[model samples]
Target: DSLPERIDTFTELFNYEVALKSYDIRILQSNYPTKLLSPDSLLPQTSDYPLKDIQQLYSLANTCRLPLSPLITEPLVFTRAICKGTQLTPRWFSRSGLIHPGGGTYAARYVEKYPELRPKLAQYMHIKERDNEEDELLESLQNMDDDAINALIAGASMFIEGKEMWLRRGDRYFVFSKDVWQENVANAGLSYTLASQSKSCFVKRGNICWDVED
Candidate 1:
């Protein structure tokens, strides 16, 4: 599917009911509620914490549920091809560290700005992060051609751009420049496009699933 189309499809499939309920549960279960109700509540008094707040909350909640099995399954599949340790492998570490510094800050900013896209994007990022950590993908990375590498990079960049765009619309998230974000997204998209077309091996570890057959 085309990049924009894929993004739209993902946006459509985001399960808001589950996300909202999860948010509510998180708020109630934490001291955040008390803090919000306190005289000097740090909570955004203007908009009930808004979409970004929920996204941030979800991020934190997911962290507590770390090593998410289903989500990490993809990464695990990739990891199987690389490291041999039973626990998390080098692939997992690489994927986990894929999005950092700017990317993370960008995600937080988006959650605050685009309240509506929160649930979907939150879920998307969760899945994407897992995909990054899979162990079996090292082979693919090693053998990738220039075109394939570029497309993969482009895809990663696009993911970041999409997040930035959502945040920008809400005016709550500002970055150095939209141009820079777009450039990175374009490059990532190109890399992914090429990578998808290449022949690759799949790492099968346990019940993990990967795109090795393709």
Candidate 2:
């Protein structure tokens, strides 16, 4: 099939051109049979990469809520970048990441301008974006699925609290205000304790741990 040849072309692009331009970008080697998957046999696979980026890149880091992580800077990278979608990436993006680096409205316009992938979007993404038409989609949020919702909530939390949602989902740092909660309740001191804890820790000096037992 054309898969190997196509994979070869893109792989050649990243292994040299893309990497030379940005080290932050990398190809996560993927697992594929040697006989059928010539790319892995000839070049490298993207499965070994911190494949978490395969998820976080499109979900959290790439969203407007929190913005890409500082490490996920420009010159970003991926493996099986566009081919063999089923094997390397999550099912949702099997056809494509459903992502347009330009973003939603712009992507809406992009598809319009390009008109190639215009009607083909359902092939790639479900978390759509548009004008007032966008509201209806946003309104029916939960209908999408959990991973999508989790990613968006993380984005929203980051935007509102600037607390970086991933951390909130239990990173362990904020020292309780000496009994900040009872029966899952926040006392008057909870706010003060959180505020103080937020300011007290030293994230850079490796103070990003809790375990107040020390």
Candidate 3:
């Protein structure tokens, strides 16, 4: 089979795993790989931000400057939202874009560098707190099939996006909307916190298996 030019649905994106294998074969045929698929060459294609800015942000994310409890270690998933036929929605901006982890450093170092612009930035700078119901619903969705997931989406009147695990909702079992996700960024931005917070674990006693909370 051939890879689709564009990934338009969940099935297509998942199925691409098979096509990606062929992709490697095709690229390898081009004289043992080239700039066409090299990581260094591809990095520049996705972002226009200055290298200095990107590095500084990632550094801040690793350090304590970014407020996220677990901190962000990897680049955030930045993808377009699932679009409706006629309705247009904004892309789901990862916490990196929304919070500007690097800005934390800038704010600390240049407290008065941009007095005029600083105040406006303050509005989007604060962190939000986590909600119980929101986190609970997210956990529930993980065990659901696609139709059940769709039913919830329709009932809630929301859209799903991303591509990692279970609808690519979040890093793991937890799902966060734009707002809640942002809040946790300030508190515990990384989805790994979900596992820790809920104290979820698995236990196997003989042939039986189920979840265990510590």
Could you say which candidate leads in TM-score?
2
* TM-score of model 2 vs. true structure: 0.22
Tens digit per residue, CA lDDT, model 1, 102-134: 223222233444445444433223222223332
Please give the CA lDDT of all the candidate structures. 0.30, 0.27, 0.28
* Residue pairs with clashing backbones, model 3: none
lDDT of 2 by residue, 1-214 (tens): 2322332232222212211111110120121111111222122223332445435545643342323444443213322222222122234234333333323222243344445554444323323332223242223331323332333333221111121111111221121121212211121111112322455532111112111211
Candidates in order, TM-scores: namely 0.15, 0.22, 0.17
Regions of model 3 farther than 4 Å from truth: 1-112, 115-118, 126-194, 197-214
**Runs with alpha carbons beyond 4 Å of true place in candidate 2:** 1-94, 100-110, 114-129, 132-188, 192-214
Estimate, for each residue in 85-134, the C-alpha lDDT of model 3 and write its tens digit.
12111222212333323332222122233344343333222111111222
lDDT of 1 at 73: 40
Tell me how candidate 3 scores on lDDT: 0.28
Alpha-carbon lDDT of model 2? 0.27
